[PDB]
Amino acid sequence: AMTRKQLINSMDMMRSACAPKFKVSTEMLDNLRGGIFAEDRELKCYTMCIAQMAGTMNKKGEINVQKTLAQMDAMLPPDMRDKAKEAIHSCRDVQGRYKDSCDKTFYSTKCLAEYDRDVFLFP
Ligand SMILES: Cc1ccc(C(C)C)c(O)c1
Ligand code: NA
Numbered sequence: 001a002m003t004r005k006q007l008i009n010s011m012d013m014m015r016s017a018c019a020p021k022f023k024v025s026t027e028m029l030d031n032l033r034g035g036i037f038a039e040d041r042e043l044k045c046y047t048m049c050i051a052q053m054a055g056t057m058n059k060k061g062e063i064n065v066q067k068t069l070a071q072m073d074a075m076l077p078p079d080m081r082d083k084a085k086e087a088i089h090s091c092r093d094v095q096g097r098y099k100d101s102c103d104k105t106f107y108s109t110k111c112l113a114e115y116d117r118d119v120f121l122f123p
């Protein structure tokens, strides 16, 4: 798996690719990585860009939970891995409550953060 340094490098590269497409500021992005979610459409659709980048989405605009679980195994430092997978399973009902794909990814991500704020990170 990656080390935390490697995981941050990977997340930084994803932020660098996605952030320019949206009106998202360092304050908003740093807060989001810290588990604080601005109610801002540009930030919602940034989360969807990241989810796509990360290979977690399907072409219907839903989160593929199976694929996400497999990425946690591949990528996350072991210590983050059971906790991330347990959070994903706990949060798998959230996306069904939202028609819009940027709501699905934003509110699903917020559910992961609320599950365990100490381990949560986001690009
Ligand atoms: C269940 C669930 C929750 C959150 C995410 C973000 C990475 C968007 C997922 O991919 C899957
Ligand atoms: Na857990």
Ligand code: NA
Binding pocket: 065, 092, 093, 094, 095, 096
């Ligand atoms: Na689901």
